[PDB]
Design an enzyme around this catalytic site. Structure first.
Site, PDB file in Angstrom:
ATOM      1  N   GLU B  57       0.902  -1.184   0.092  1.00  0.00           N
ATOM      2  CA  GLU B  57      -0.079  -0.219   0.012  1.00  0.00           C
ATOM      3  C   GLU B  57       0.850   1.214   0.067  1.00  0.00           C
ATOM      4  O   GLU B  57       0.696   2.214  -0.610  1.00  0.00           O
ATOM      5  CB  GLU B  57      -1.042   0.097   1.236  1.00  0.00           C
ATOM      6  CG  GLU B  57      -2.003   1.107   1.264  1.00  0.00           C
ATOM      7  CD  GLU B  57      -2.658   1.498   2.542  1.00  0.00           C
ATOM      8  OE1 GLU B  57      -3.234   0.862   3.304  1.00  0.00           O
ATOM      9  OE2 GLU B  57      -2.088   2.354   3.198  1.00  0.00           O
ATOM     10  N   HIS B  58       2.069   1.134   0.599  1.00  0.00           N
ATOM     11  CA  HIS B  58       3.041   2.124   0.786  1.00  0.00           C
ATOM     12  C   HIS B  58       3.898   2.466  -0.400  1.00  0.00           C
ATOM     13  O   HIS B  58       4.854   3.455  -0.328  1.00  0.00           O
ATOM     14  CB  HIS B  58       4.018   1.909   2.012  1.00  0.00           C
ATOM     15  CG  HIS B  58       3.210   2.569   3.315  1.00  0.00           C
ATOM     16  ND1 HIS B  58       2.089   3.652   3.158  1.00  0.00           N
ATOM     17  CD2 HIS B  58       3.492   2.584   4.646  1.00  0.00           C
ATOM     18  CE1 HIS B  58       1.775   4.016   4.277  1.00  0.00           C
ATOM     19  NE2 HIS B  58       2.692   3.402   5.369  1.00  0.00           N
ATOM     20  N   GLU B 134       6.049   4.698  11.465  1.00  0.00           N
ATOM     21  CA  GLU B 134       4.723   4.774  11.197  1.00  0.00           C
ATOM     22  C   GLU B 134       4.080   3.970  12.012  1.00  0.00           C
ATOM     23  O   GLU B 134       2.664   3.898  12.193  1.00  0.00           O
ATOM     24  CB  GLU B 134       4.445   4.792   9.635  1.00  0.00           C
ATOM     25  CG  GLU B 134       2.869   4.763   9.347  1.00  0.00           C
ATOM     26  CD  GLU B 134       2.668   4.100   7.982  1.00  0.00           C
ATOM     27  OE1 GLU B 134       3.392   3.150   7.689  1.00  0.00           O
ATOM     28  OE2 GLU B 134       2.198   5.071   7.133  1.00  0.00           O
TER      29      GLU B 134
END
Lengths: 100, 442, 406, 195
Positions: B57-58, B134
């Protein structure tokens, strides 16, 4: 023939709670409703009532009463709480009915 | 009203000889939003494969080979479209929102990601340490950690138990490859859905997808979507104490049915009845939701929320609250008690509101374009098609008291729940206790 | 049959603009916007707005705090109140026939508030928290102070009741604050999912006050304030501004495009782990423009500086007529997009049905933004660099500079 | 010797109001200046006194106001704090200020100086009676200098200047940059940009 007005006056002096010098309402037993009622009381009247009660107690505790002068007169008795108390009650009765 | 529902534009859907299913809803709206919703997730990850879906996703945005970073973004920014997305445990998506005057342009973009991501080995080694940071942030969001831990123990041992984020050790060692090993493995048309909402004309969409999704399935495999390994629910607890924290969180739940199951309705209505509280509200007078009321009167919790988080074949029907080190107990008690009440002596007058409350979220669940696409994106993927508000309506416009009782009890009464609690929880009683809190001394 | 039904507007004999728009959604939402807010407070009565904003759920004359809350909930209702320094919007939402019923309560909440002296005297301690939660967001902190440092008199007044006044607001200051701002001329019974003939037949009961403009908030004098809040949060929040732009002020749109013309520049102008953006607020008789920069401690000095140079060299000709085309479009977007959600939308048919009384179609609203470009921007920026600047800041700061250090 | 030495003090024309409604405002205004040991010091001191009967007797009504003076190692301050009723806060500071103003524009008889020059002689000597306010003097000096200015010359130094400065020390105030501080209802109190 016989005025309820004429009567109440009777009972009032008969109850003689004014001999201690406290308004009707200063007597009503303190139930859930009244408490909430009184808890809605403007701070003015609250401290008023308090003292009147403490004075009442102090008298009572001395077995002696208030000079014929200081008794409160029927017509001058201030139903300081009846109004709040009433809203309360209906507020409740409104809720109690809705929860059905 | 009911007429308002009915006059609601049907949703168009048609799959490719490829596999993708292309659906969407049309309105007047200049704007819109469109996205590909993959049947991909963490659940689909392994012991050494866990994380990818994320680490992915990143990098799903930092470019493709056709158009590297600086350009994609520049091409996206420059046109004013918003390309956002996520990745859960059994659901991942990537939606964009432009002016519908870009269907064909947005669509292409979409395809160019789900299929060709730069995965720049140099871009990765950065996003690596980015996540690892994160992640360290996701961590003090007790509001969440409390849920993963819930999963962690609720579905201990199986695939769900693994957190969408994945262990630090994997994110610290995922290979340029493993990511691709993930992409090429799950990112396939049969499990992907192209959905959109706004001013778009289905056909134009189709053709563009049907145009930029030039996928071709040889084998019978490619055309078949694997069903997942069943996850064992395990009534248990997991306590991560720390009186050092402002307060403790508690999350308990029973196994959920799974999207399919028709009862998820009545059940959804259930959660409608106790709902949620949160000190900012304005109601010690609140609607039935006593949990709410009582939460006020006796200052039980900072906030509590009911949830029926469900998946393909399983689920997590419970409740989560946040409370001072000190009122944790009284809360559970009062709360857990509600479940009982709920499925032992719930009334019509109650369900009546519940419903309408759902019918309100039911509607506002679809508020705008992005959100609508979500359902479409979802609906198909997990349910098979699209559930119209006209449908959901009946579904839950026909749930009576006796039905809620029959349901909740069926999934709550004397069931072994899973509790999760981080923070100063010294006050939360052992299990047996919160366990025998499942049956009402009727 | 296509779902189009022109949004009728009919200004009542009062000044009460009634905007509807039957969009056919299952769930419709009515909303009473007002020109009230924390701009009309004096050195005293401060926060009476805020409190008011909470007294939403307090007994009226047509329905008790009880009835109202359970009343709205017995329908799957939703009452809430969004407010800004210069405007309070009382929305309410539901569906079908329930809109009719959902009304009774909204009607009473906004016109017949009999703010009982206990309920409020028992509600005030809420301010302590309602504020406490909002203040977990450092951003809101800096801003509250920004306006303080940006002004001096109305408007510069806080949005969240100051501490010192948490339990001193009087049940009176509430009526008095309403009797003076919740008046027909400065209200608007906006709404969606409704037939206008019905939304009108309601304004009839809503006719209980006239007083055009009861207390009118003083004009807003500008100031080059600077107020730092040393609190060591490992990461600084900073904002800088130069008074400017006003809603309706032709000079507005310019920044908007400069708002976008800026961003990719300040950001892509400041390398390292941070965040920075172009700040823009348009108020009735004033506004603001600048940039807030959430940045790590020690790297706070550098960050704002670079962010600034950019707003600087942006005025000294570093803006291709392309940057403008791109940015001109993003607004077209952000505008239209943030209108999808009937609440961010009903917010538009309202704002206007209040400040003007009109409704700029999506066509011309574009033709107006399309209208300017090269022509301004480069210059809108210049305005920033010259005029007086007012900064706000929260964080370790020991490494963050002051305006006198540009 | 000097382990961490405190950075020099950069000046700033700050202004920070604290709205808190105390029925009575406290306000202070200053213009950086004077430093301990700085020959330019004593001047304000006498201006500190030259001022006072003036600002006060210059502002009629129920209040209080005085000449503010702080002398630091590499800097100092000078101004006036004015405790004043709310609504009458605007007026008070204003008038207090005009006075520090017209004090620079020649409203200081060489007499005002003689009187004030003496009060310091007093306040100095007096606030030395109490061995603690006294041991505070033999100390301050035995620290900043290493000497001990006898009561004789400490006078000869204050005696030393007068007419010569003051009028001017005041001027310094009116021109330089000003920094205000304030606590109180304030809604009636002005800002430095309103002088």
């Amino acid at each position: 023939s016989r005025w309820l007005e004429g009567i109440r006056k009777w009972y009032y002096n008969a109850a003689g709670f004014n001999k201690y010098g406290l308004m009707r309402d200063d007597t009503i037993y303190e139930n859930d409703d009244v408490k909430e009622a009184i808890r809605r009381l403007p701070e003015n009247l609250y401290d008023d009532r308090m003292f009147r009660i403490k004075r009442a107690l102090d008298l009572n505790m001395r077995q002696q009463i208030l000079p014929k002068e200081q008794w409160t007169k029927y017509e001058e008795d201030v139903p300081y709480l009846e109004p709040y108390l009433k809203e309360v009650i209906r507020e409740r009765k409104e809720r109690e009915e809705w929860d059905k | 009203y009911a007429q308002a529902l009915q006059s609601v534009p049907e949703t168009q859907v048609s799959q490719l000889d490829n596999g993708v299913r292309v659906a969407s809803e049309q309105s007047s709206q200049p704007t819109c939003t469109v996205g590909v919703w993959i049947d991909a997730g963490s659940r689909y990850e392994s012991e050494k494969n866990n994380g990818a879906g994320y680490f992915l996703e990143h990098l799903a945005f930092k470019g493709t080979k056709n158009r590297p970073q600086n350009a994609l973004e520049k091409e996206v920014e420059s046109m004013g479209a918003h390309l956002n997305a996520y990745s859960s445990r059994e659901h991942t998506a990537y939606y964009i929102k432009a002016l519908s005057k870009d269907v064909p342009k947005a669509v292409e973009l979409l395809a160019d990601i789900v299929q060709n991501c730069s995965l720049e080995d140099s871009q990765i080694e950065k996003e690596r340490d980015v996540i690892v940071r994160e992640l360290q942030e996701n961590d003090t969001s007790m509001r969440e950690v409390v849920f993963n831990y819930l999963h962690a123990t609720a579905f201990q041992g199986t695939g769900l138990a693994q957190s969408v984020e994945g262990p630090s050790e994997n994110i610290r060692k995922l290979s340029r490859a493993d990511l691709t090993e993930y992409l090429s493995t799950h990112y396939t048309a049969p499990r992907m859905v192209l959905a959109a909402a706004g001013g778009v004309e289905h056909q134009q969409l189709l053709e563009l997808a049907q145009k930029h999704f030039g996928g071709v399935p040889f084998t019978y495999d490619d055309d078949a979507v694997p069903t997942l390994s069943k996850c064992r629910f395990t009534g248990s607890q997991i306590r991560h104490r720390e009186d050092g924290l402002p307060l403790a969180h508690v999350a308990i739940a029973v196994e959920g049915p799974g999207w399919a199951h028709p009862d998820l309705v009545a059940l959804q209505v259930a959660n409608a009845i106790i709902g949620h509280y949160d000190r900012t509200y304005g109601g010690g007078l609140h609607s039935s939701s006593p949990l709410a009321s009582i939460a006020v009167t006796n200052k039980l919790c900072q906030s509590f929320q009911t949830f029926s988080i469900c998946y393909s074949e399983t689920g997590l029907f419970g409740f989560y609250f946040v409370c001072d080190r000190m009122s944790i107990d009284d809360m559970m008690f009062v709360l857990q008690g509600q479940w009982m009440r709920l499925c032992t002596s719930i009334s019509e007058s109650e369900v009546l509101r519940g419903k309408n409350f759902l019918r309100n979220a039911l509607v506002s669940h679809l508020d705008g374009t992005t959100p609508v696409c979500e359902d479409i994106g979802r609906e198909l993927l997990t349910y098979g098609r699209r559930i119209p508000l006209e449908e959901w309506e009946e579904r839950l416009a026909e749930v009576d008291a006796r039905m809620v009782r029959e349901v909740c009890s069926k999934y709550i009464y004397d069931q072994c729940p899973a509790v999760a609690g981080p923070g100063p929880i010294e006050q939360l009683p052992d299990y047996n206790r919160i366990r025998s809190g499942m049956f009402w001394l009727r | 049959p296509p779902h189009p039904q022109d949004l009728e507007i009919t200004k009542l004999p009062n000044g009460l603009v009634i905007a509807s728009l039957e969009n056919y959604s299952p769930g419709s939402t009515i909303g009473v916007f007002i020109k009230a807010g924390s701009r009309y407070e004096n050195s005293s009565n401060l926060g009476t707005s805020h409190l008011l904003r909470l007294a939403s759920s307090l007994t009226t004359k047509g329905a008790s705090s009880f009835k109202i809350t359970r009343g709205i909930e017995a329908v799957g209702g939703k009452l809430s109140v969004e407010s800004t320094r210069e405007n309070m919007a009382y929305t309410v939402e539901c569906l079908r026939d329930d809109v009719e019923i959902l009304m009774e309560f909204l009607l009473n909440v906004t016109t017949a508030p009999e703010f009982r002296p206990w309920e409020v005297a028992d509600l005030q301690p809420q301010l302590k928290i309602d504020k406490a939660v909002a203040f977990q967001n450092p951003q809101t902190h800096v801003i509250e102070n920004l306006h303080a440092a940006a002004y001096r008199n109305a408007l510069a007044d806080s949005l969240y009741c100051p501490d010192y006044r948490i339990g001193k607001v009087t049940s009176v200051e509430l009526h008095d604050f309403v009797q003076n701002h919740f008046t027909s001329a400065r209200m608007a019974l906006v709404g969606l999912g409704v037939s206008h003939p019905v939304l009108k037949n309601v304004a009839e009961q809503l006719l209980n006050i006239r007083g055009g403009l009861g207390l009118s908030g003083a004009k807003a004098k500008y100031r080059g304030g600077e107020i730092r809040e040393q609190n060591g949060d490992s990461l600084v929040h900073a904002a800088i501004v130069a008074e400017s732009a006003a809603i309706g002020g032709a000079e507005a749109n310019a920044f908007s495009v400069l708002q976008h013309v800026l961003g990719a520049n300040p950001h892509v102008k400041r390398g390292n782990p941070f965040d920075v953006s172009a700040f823009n607020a348009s108020y009735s008789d004033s506004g603001l423009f600048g940039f807030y920069t959430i940045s790590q401690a020690a790297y706070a000095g550098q960050v704002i500086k670079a962010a600034y140079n950019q707003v600087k060299t942006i005025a000294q000709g570093n803006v291709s007529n392309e940057n403008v085309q791109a940015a001109k479009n993003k607004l077209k977007a952000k505008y239209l997009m943030s209108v999808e959600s009937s609440e961010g939308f009903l917010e538009e048919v309202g704002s206007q049905a209040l400040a003007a009384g009109s409704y700029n179609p999506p066509s011309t609203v574009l033709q107006q933004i399309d209208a300017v470009a090269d022509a301004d921007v480069i210059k809108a920026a210049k305005k920033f660099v010259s005029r007086q600047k007012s900064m706000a800041a929260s964080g370790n700061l020991g490494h963050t500079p002051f305006v006198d250090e540009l």
